[PDB]
Write a protein that binds this DNA or RNA. Sequence first.
RNA 1: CACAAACGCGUCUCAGAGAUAAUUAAUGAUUUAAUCUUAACCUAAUUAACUCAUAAUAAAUCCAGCCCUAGAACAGGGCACA
RNA 2: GAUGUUGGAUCAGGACACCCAAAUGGUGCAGCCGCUAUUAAAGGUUCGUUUGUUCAACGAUUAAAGUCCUACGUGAUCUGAG
RNA 3: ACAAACUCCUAGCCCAAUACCGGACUAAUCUAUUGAAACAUAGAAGCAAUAAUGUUAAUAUGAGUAACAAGAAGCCUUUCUCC
Lengths: 110, 153, 148, 118, 307, 99
Amino acid sequence: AAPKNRRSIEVNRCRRRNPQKLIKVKNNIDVCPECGHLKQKHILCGYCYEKVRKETAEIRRQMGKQEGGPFRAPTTETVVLYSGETPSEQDQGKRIIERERKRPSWFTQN
Amino acid sequence: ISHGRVFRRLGLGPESRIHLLQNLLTGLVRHERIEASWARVDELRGYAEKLIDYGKLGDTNERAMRMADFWLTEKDLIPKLFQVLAPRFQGQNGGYTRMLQIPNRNEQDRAKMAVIEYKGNCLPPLPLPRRDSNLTLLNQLLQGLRQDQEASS
Amino acid sequence: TARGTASRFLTSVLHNGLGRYVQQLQRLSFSLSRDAPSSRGAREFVEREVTDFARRNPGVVIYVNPRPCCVPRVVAEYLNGAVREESIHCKSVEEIAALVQKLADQSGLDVIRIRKPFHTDSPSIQGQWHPFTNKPTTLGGLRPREVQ
Amino acid sequence: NTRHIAFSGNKWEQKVYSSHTGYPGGFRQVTAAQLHQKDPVAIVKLAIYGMLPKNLHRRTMMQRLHLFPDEDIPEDILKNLVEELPQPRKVPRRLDEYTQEEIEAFPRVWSPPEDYRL
Amino acid sequence: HGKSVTWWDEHLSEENVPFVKQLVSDENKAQLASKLCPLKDEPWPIHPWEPGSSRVGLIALKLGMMPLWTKDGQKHVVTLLQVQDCHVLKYTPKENHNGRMAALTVGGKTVSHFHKSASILEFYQELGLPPKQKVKIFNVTENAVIKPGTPLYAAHFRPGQYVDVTAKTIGKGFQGVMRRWGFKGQPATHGQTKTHRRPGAISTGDVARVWPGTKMPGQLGNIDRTAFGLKVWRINTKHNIIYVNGSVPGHKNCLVKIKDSKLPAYKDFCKNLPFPTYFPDGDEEALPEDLYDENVCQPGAPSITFT
Amino acid sequence: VKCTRARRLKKRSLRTLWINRITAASQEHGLKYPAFIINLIKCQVELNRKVLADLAIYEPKTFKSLAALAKRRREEGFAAALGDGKEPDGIFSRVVQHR
RNA sequence: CACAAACGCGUCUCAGAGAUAAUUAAUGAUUUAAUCUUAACCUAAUUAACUCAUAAUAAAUCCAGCCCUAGAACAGGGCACA
RNA sequence: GAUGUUGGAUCAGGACACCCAAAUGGUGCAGCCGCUAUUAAAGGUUCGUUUGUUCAACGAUUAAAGUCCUACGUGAUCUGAG
RNA sequence: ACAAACUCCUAGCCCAAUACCGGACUAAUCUAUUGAAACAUAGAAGCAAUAAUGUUAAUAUGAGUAACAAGAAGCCUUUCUCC
Ligand SMILES: [Mg+2]
Ligand SMILES: [Mg+2]
Ligand SMILES: [Mg+2]
Ligand SMILES: [Mg+2]
Ligand SMILES: [Mg+2]
Ligand SMILES: [Mg+2]
Ligand SMILES: [Mg+2]
Ligand SMILES: [Mg+2]
Ligand SMILES: [Mg+2]
Ligand SMILES: [Mg+2]
Ligand SMILES: [Mg+2]
Ligand SMILES: [Mg+2]
Ligand SMILES: [Mg+2]
Ligand SMILES: [Mg+2]
Ligand SMILES: [Mg+2]
Ligand SMILES: [Mg+2]
Ligand SMILES: [Mg+2]
Ligand SMILES: [Mg+2]
Ligand SMILES: [Mg+2]
Ligand SMILES: [Mg+2]
Ligand SMILES: [Mg+2]
Ligand SMILES: [Mg+2]
Ligand SMILES: [Mg+2]
Ligand SMILES: [Mg+2]
Ligand SMILES: [Mg+2]
Ligand SMILES: [Mg+2]
Ligand SMILES: [Mg+2]
Ligand SMILES: [Mg+2]
Ligand SMILES: [Mg+2]
Ligand SMILES: [Mg+2]
Ligand SMILES: [Mg+2]
Ligand SMILES: [Mg+2]
Ligand SMILES: [Mg+2]
Ligand SMILES: [Mg+2]
Ligand SMILES: [Mg+2]
Ligand SMILES: [Mg+2]
Ligand SMILES: [Zn+2]
């Protein structure tokens, strides 16, 4: 089918300036109790999740260092250590990961 | 019409979606925490959860074993399933898994992304949401109702 | 075109002509060239007529400047604060004369559609119609179906 | 007193009011008698409606028009009544309205034969 | 002012959460068990049975379907309908609604306060019931009227009767013209191109428009329809469960509106039924576990032998 | 263009507006239009319809007097034609000439 | 029928009152018999339409999120038990 | 400087000059069939073999298998055997 | 009664038209003299565009429509899953 007549700027306006086509204001926006940045109420803080992600990555590298193959994965639970720490009896008998950074604020010792 | 359908249709078809979930489950069971597409993860969660109740059936059970054979691609991973993952889950029936929604991917496609995890993995704690503390004016206003529900009983 | 322009009701400037009529034209400024042909008529007018016209009308000032101008012009100005522009460009003496006399007799008001020909304050002497005016009243001022 | 309309001629019988739903076979022809039977107000409303100019304001002046089957009026609308209009037709009285004075006053035209029975 | 989105559960600590929940559920049990006793409270005038009467109806929950048999040997399927919480809400007098029959507002099963709206929870706190899911209106003659805030049970209908069932029908969504209407298709194989389903020509050449009636692909099935002529077979007194005949419109576990048949044949069937309604308090007798119609093969029984 | 054809129409429009006004006030006195106008003429009163209508809006008194005049003359005409004799001239039926 | 569903080849269900047209009839005048009457008064008996009883629908504004027999989008129903 | 044409497929809208169902009048109407006239258009008006075929013939039925108008309805929905 | 381009009235620059035909003006250019802030007499011409499916350039409309692409997770180049 072929359009019979050029449409007006009026008609075009009322089509694409229509409220249903508009970008609505999201009202679930809040601030992070931690870093005072912003996140939607139901979603993790991007920034905090970032600190996390980085740390996780480094850990995974250092546990790719203790592993000498593509297929070699431990049969024991593992735990991570930081400057100035020691395996407890509860946590000994497990694979240990020795990292350089001091134990971060958010990360607990457990 | 979809009424009462329990599965989302992913990948090239039925079998494809299954091998998709194969990889996702493999990765979950190796790395213990993964982020991926919300639907794919939400979907996977069921599989991740029941795999652990196969693990709970012991290294000896045959059904459970070839099950994990199929469902874990790196064969290396099958021990970690029975020896590691399954025993550290005993008391908790179904509480294996944390799945949360992460900010939308920063690629141009901008998908809706989640992260999925085995509780009691050794990894940095996900920055979960906390409830408000009990010093908050509102909760505090409820502790009064609380103690006066104790005092009239 | 009617819907094109503004309008004005018919009006007097400062209620002119009521107490005493006051010629509304204030000053005239002629600009012409002693040399250029374009001003030819307006030169002759300046010679012969201007003088007498001035005597005709005490109330108006006339400023006449020869200057090196190529388009002869006369600018009326009015007590109304209004100003009107004109070209005397290439016109006869007769022509000019008639035009200056046009300027002489104007309101200074603007030429726009004049909505109706009659300006009347309080047209309504002896009354102005309202609905009741021709209706007979009843006893007690009762409604149609009201009872007492 | 809308229900009490008079219709000259047999018009009760042959004037039909039509309208269409817009659905195929949804077309409706109705005898005036029937219509008025169902809804007293209609007849007059259609007369007045069809009688205004056909522009928009008809719709609006249709608002200022209040129509009552009998004399039952909200004391709201009773309260604001200005004036009464003259009845546009002089209603003929039945036989039984006439005073005996006027009955006697009108002359006996023909003298009937006594023998004849009535 | 940028005022934020708020739901109830937001700022509640781990501690107060179950407290809120218990508090509410408890005041629910209290609220329902309170008006559990209608007849001694302030029962409205009970009126005799007038011939042109219309009884109140009910709100049910469609359970499932089950086969059931007649002493004659023929087989049926019947609907398991369960009243859960049926409490009349408000009452509109005759002239304030239809100018003909007065209307009786009735409530459905109970739900969470947290997810409803202020106006409503206010209305309910001025009655003192917990919140209902579905709220319908029954047209009723002034001698059937009850006191609002009153309970209702499945003994309202006695076995053998016919009833009427209204519900939101199963939604198929936006469906094609085959299914929405029952148009034939075009044949599949003899060379059709991209036609095998489409509605075919929708109109006439000379009309040059299409008619306001015309049947066309669109929204199908989520909408209200009513089945008539449904016999009731069996009532379960303890669990409040009606067995109605054949099929009732709606999905299983959806909310339903039952009444007596306004069908012509069944018009006067009201005289023999518990009318204002049925009343557990007043008779002070217990009705049996189940009420069967006389046509009915019972779950334990002779095991019929023809003769 | 439409402007010009309109310029010619405008005068019709006005006249109709007028006539209806005249009609309206005439009605208010219980007198139809044509009767009013003619029987106003027969009294040797030439009045425009413009000025008539403005006498009906802004001069209800004067106007009511006018309609009375014409009413008077009309009935005087009914009796003039019904009388069937030459002697009576209604006091307003007389036809003046100029001086 | 390899999904908790859809689905037919399967199961369930479907209605009173009024109003007429052509015809029949009864009382009965114009024309004192008769005559259903483009005469009144009441009347009767009489197709389909078509109106209407009756049924549907019918509580204005919490809605982040997550479920859903609700759904293309948007809307709709759920999320206190347990 | 194109109003794309037969037949079928789909979906029908309309008419009444009625093929069914409905209410009747007349009969060279006993009754059963029949034949004619009146009134009524809400609903219906089949499956096959042969022909591109519409007609038509034939097989079997049915309460009947109506006559028509819609660009000989419908090809920006299909079909081209013609 | 109401109702025209007819006819009155008050003023006038004082009476419709396609093809063909006669007349009076005038836009904008340049040249000759004037003019000088836009100019007036003549003389000349590539002398005036709401319409050629006109030519070139640019912009709209259809339209943000139709349409197009990158197997998964991670330790970032290791593993899987497929053809
Ligand atoms: Mg689903
Ligand atoms: Mg896909
Ligand atoms: Mg889910
Ligand atoms: Mg649905
Ligand atoms: Mg098919
Ligand atoms: Mg195909
Ligand atoms: Mg093709
Ligand atoms: Mg004129
Ligand atoms: Mg007789
Ligand atoms: Mg007789
Ligand atoms: Mg109705
Ligand atoms: Mg909601
Ligand atoms: Mg063309
Ligand atoms: Mg074309
Ligand atoms: Mg049809
Ligand atoms: Mg006929
Ligand atoms: Mg028949
Ligand atoms: Mg038909
Ligand atoms: Mg041939
Ligand atoms: Mg042939
Ligand atoms: Mg043939
Ligand atoms: Mg054709
Ligand atoms: Mg064709
Ligand atoms: Mg077409
Ligand atoms: Mg061919
Ligand atoms: Mg005239
Ligand atoms: Mg040129
Ligand atoms: Mg141009
Ligand atoms: Mg041209
Ligand atoms: Mg073209
Ligand atoms: Mg062009
Ligand atoms: Mg564009
Ligand atoms: Mg897009
Ligand atoms: Mg489009
Ligand atoms: Mg697309
Ligand atoms: Mg690809
Ligand atoms: Zn943060």
